[PDB]
Ligand binder design. Structure first.
Ligand code: 88Y
Length: 108
């Protein structure tokens, strides 16, 4: 539905909001695979995803429904959980952002 995709745009807008910026910032833009320590990122992560790409996919109507938009948000989180150590700061940040996402996505 067209109405449920406007709600997806609204969930993504909240994720980009100042309220969640302290922990959402690592998810804003694609992972810089040229940064120190990330030489192996592309070897472990087959399908990278970030909030700016999801936003472009929405604007370009690349999602048939809320399920497809949801899949890419969760892909972005699963990439973070798969790649990093479970005790890493970015994993806790992903968990805080995903709490915002799952609560909003569930209530639509
Ligand atoms: C490895 C990993 O999981 C990462 C790394 C970044 C990241 C770090 C610094 C500046 C921008 C970024 N995008 N973001 C995630 C989700």
């Amino acid at each position: 539905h067209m109405e449920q995709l406007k709600c997806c745009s609204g969930i993504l807008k909240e994720m980009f909001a100042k309220k969640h910026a302290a922990y959402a910032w690592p998810f804003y833009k694609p992972v810089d695979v040229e940064a120190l320590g990330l030489h192996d990122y592309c070897d472990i992560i087959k399908h990278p995803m970030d909030m700016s790409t999801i936003k472009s996919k929405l604007e370009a109507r690349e999602y048939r429904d809320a399920q497809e938009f949801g899949a890419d948000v969760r892909l972005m989180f699963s990439n973070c959980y798969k790649y990093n150590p479970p005790d890493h700061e970015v994993v806790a940040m992903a968990r805080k952002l995903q709490d915002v996402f799952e609560m909003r996505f569930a209530k639509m």
